[PDB]
Amino acid sequence: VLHQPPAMSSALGTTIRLTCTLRNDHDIGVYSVYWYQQRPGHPPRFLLRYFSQSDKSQGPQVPPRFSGSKDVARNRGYLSISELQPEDEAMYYCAMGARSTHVFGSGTQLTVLSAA
């Protein structure tokens, strides 16, 4: 139901956009997209919930360089991370539903490269 690419890489200081793709006889225009970061040996950490530019919630202490968006026509939810830092290297999960249920995507492993 939720596709995420297995792995993405980007260099220090850049901006990357992770995609979470509602496949696809459901409408992303009616769901909040939840995003979580997970580092090995640690629990998931809530980053942000994104429904629209006027209906979103940033997680506690998550800097604004983590931001949500959507492409509704493509059934996609996005997590953008600007000014990538070495500690952003982690697993990123999207999730949908409010529970009731919370279905997770398979997660994108993000590698932050020392050099582009």
UniProtKB/Swiss-Prot annotation:
Keyword Endoplasmic reticulum tagged: yes
UniProt-annotated stretches for the region Framework-1: 1-20
GO BP annotations, alphabetical order: immune response
S-S bonds: 20-94
Sequence segments annotated as region (Framework-2): 36-49
Tissue expression notes: Only expressed by pre-B-cells.
Cellular component terms per the entry's GO annotation: endoplasmic reticulum; extracellular region; immunoglobulin complex
Chain intervals for the UniProt region annotation (Framework-3): 61-94
Ig-like V-type domain boundaries: 1-100
Complementarity-determining-1: region residues: 21-35
Localisation: Endoplasmic reticulum
Keywords: Disulfide bond, Endoplasmic reticulum, Immunoglobulin domain, Signal
Function comment: Associates with the Ig-mu chain to form a molecular complex that is expressed on the surface of pre-B-cells. This complex presumably regulates Ig gene rearrangements in the early steps of B-cell differentiation.
Entry's family note: Belongs to the immunoglobulin superfamily.
Quaternary assembly: Interacts with IGLL1. Interacts with SYNV1/HRD1 (via N-terminus); this interaction leads to increased VPREB1 ubiquitination and degradation in pre-B cells, possibly through a lysosomal, not proteasomal, pathway.
Name the UniProt record assigns to this protein: Immunoglobulin iota chain
Shown segment, full-protein numbering: 22 to 121 of 145
